[PDB]
Symmetry: C3
Subunit: 300 residues, 3 copies
């Protein structure tokens, strides 16, 4: 009868694992992970967690320990995929559409802070599409005020249905501890990158064939436009998908697949996460007139 | 169907702005503000955000940038009022009655910590009428556990209806980051001070004409009284509104306009923030007997 | 109409007090407490709050001050019991069954951080049965993300009904400030220890007569077992209750009174907090076969 997160945490907590690492001088590292495929034993984590690893072990919240092998990783986005050796009676997580997230939505962080064991912390979605934090090469972070500390890395950011909305990755902390400014790689980005690693053992980096800057209020005022966020195209590379689709220098990319862009940095991370050959719909503004253009991504 | 703060934040987030400051060797400061009047472009902020500013710019959550001029400020309470130069299509905030607040009420803190952009954080109202923190000259702070960090100053403390309950001002933090002890100037105090600055370009400090100390459990025990918080009057200045009203040395001021006082410091801050000439009702206690006295405020 | 914690905190906050201590060069210390018996003026707190006290005073949230005397304390579990001298019109707390708690349940911390005055902070139950933190001799901590800081210790951890679920005791903080990793002694442990101090002025430490290590996934794999958390028995002391009940070396204690054990350390703290002479039911596993064994506790 009393409101609680316990009925949904009960079912979902076994999917979030502790990731123990050993490697090169000898060292012992600790982070978290999320079981994305119970049958194959596929675990999502951060690349900075398994980076110098020679031996990787996974621990379930029931005490069961398993060995794990690195399937693949991406240095730029900070996502690594592991495979549990001889998986058995595993629980997997359901993945939500992180593009349907909004500031104010409730979030639960599940990880292993300070190697204490499985810890759940609660908060809200503080911000979305966060970039220019110079944490990662590719950033499109969910920001949350759920307490996220060292050892929370690779862990789950969940909604109130216990579905994955993101992979806890970094924090802003003056003194090494949580102040309520935490960052998660969104679920759609982690899911897509995970698929590339299950299919090829490596990521396939997509590119538009565009060169540009951040759209500003200053460009918008100069051309009497009602949008001030997005990508300002300065150059369209010849022979690229963008040239073939009819993208022109001076265009303002406003949307990607119908969803508005809050920055060029968001566009850059969303396109590099997408596989070459994939077709995307670009929302454009040419001399103050709207256009929709379908672009086939090239390889980087 | 899932509970969320997103439906109310969607409407109210455009009203909370980022305040960028440049001044003197040159410096670049960052804080927050709240649009209190969309038509006139009136932005509430903290005085310490604006203190040494030569250039003030406001940024909306849609990316629009505006110039701003200082209308007026109060050093003692830490409130400043700005006016956006050439305001257009602005959203203003609804202001709630902060005197109707209670410990355990839900609060949403909105601002720009570490210059990240608009960030929303969640908590409860932890305490009310907080004084003697030696932060400000006049204090009557709302205490919240919503994550408040450097850059949140002048930002919004909202209720679940998205109404302003306070202006985020200070924090208690051993290591420069949030530990869940944040302070906000209450909306009633901020609203009144803002009116004085729109009307006169300066504040009008009111006074009772009373000299006193804090009421204690010790005074209460000595005189067999059942109240231990409020103001113990030691002197009534002749010719003052308190003298004329019949306030007498030895009286114990228990209430202000029917609302109980938790301290003399609260009385001091509430009276100073009230305009001279205003009539106030004083809940009093002489020789253990209750009295109500109407006092016309003088100037300080 | 708006959802809030205020309706339930209104009735319950008076039960949580501020504990002021004076001792030896003279010092002034500050912590919190909980009124467990309004008639007798029994206040539960932390031993570490009262440790060097020569004078103890209690302050209610209405401003009333009382003197207090130490009834008894336990160094190992960090529980102390005080008695208010000449109690009058006191509010007591209702105590909940902490064994019925689950990760995700909502919690409210009520204490006196940095000596500010009563403060309420909100969060969830992050983890349960936390041991091996080398904070206390006996640990079976509730972990919460409710902001707990210096001054909160000895204070209340409450559920949404305003019932005591634990006594805020310690935190994990890299820089001395809350990062959302707080620990409480569970209410069942605190209630039992408090009863022993009201009844005997001292605690009564129970023992099984067992020597063991932590059960691991390694032991479990070696003996083809489906449990990896508990106590691995290496030695049964002759003449002990365990010897008399047929506990043998090599047994794996899985449960205590039908409740699964997450560690040997949990078993240790639950047994030492139970009074000698009490009969306990031990969920056991010998040669991979389940057994229930009833053991009479000895004295330590």
């Amino acid at each position: 009868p009393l409101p609680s997160l316990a009925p949904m945490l009960e079912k979902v907590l076994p999917a979030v694992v502790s990731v123990r690492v050993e490697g090169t001088q000898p060292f012992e590292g600790l982070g978290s992970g999320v079981i994305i495929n119970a049958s194959k034993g596929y675990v999502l984590t951060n690349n900075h967690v398994i980076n110098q690893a020679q031996k990787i072990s996974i621990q379930l919240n029931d005490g069961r320990e398993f060995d794990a092998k690195l399937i693949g990783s991406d240095d730029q986005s900070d996502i690594a995929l592991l495979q549990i050796q001889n998986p058995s009676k595993l629980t997997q997580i359901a993945i939500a559409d992180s593009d349907k997230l909004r500031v104010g939505d409730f979030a639960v962080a599940v990880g292993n802070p300070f190697g204490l064991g499985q810890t759940a912390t609660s908060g809200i979605v503080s911000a979305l599409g966060r970039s220019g934090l110079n944490l990662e090469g590719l950033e499109n972070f969910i920001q949350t005020d759920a307490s996220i500390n060292r050892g929370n890395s690779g862990g789950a950011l969940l909604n109130l249905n216990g579905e994955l909305i993101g992979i806890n990755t970094a924090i802003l902390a003056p003194g090494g501890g949580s102040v309520g400014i935490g960052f998660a790689i969104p679920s759609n980005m982690a899911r897509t990158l995970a698929q590339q690693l299950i299919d090829f053992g490596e990521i396939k980096r997509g590119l538009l064939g565009i060169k540009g800057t951040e759209m500003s209020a200053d460009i918008a005022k100069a051309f009497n436009l009602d949008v001030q966020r997005g990508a300002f195209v300065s150059e369209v590379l010849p022979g690229s998908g963008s040239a073939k689709a009819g993208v022109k220098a001076g265009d303002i990319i406003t949307s990607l697949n119908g969803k508005p862009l809050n920055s060029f940095a968001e566009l850059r991370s969303r396109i590099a996460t997408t596989e070459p050959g994939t077709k995307v719909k670009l929302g454009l503004l040419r001399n103050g007139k709207p256009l929709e253009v379908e672009v086939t991504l090239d390889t980087s």
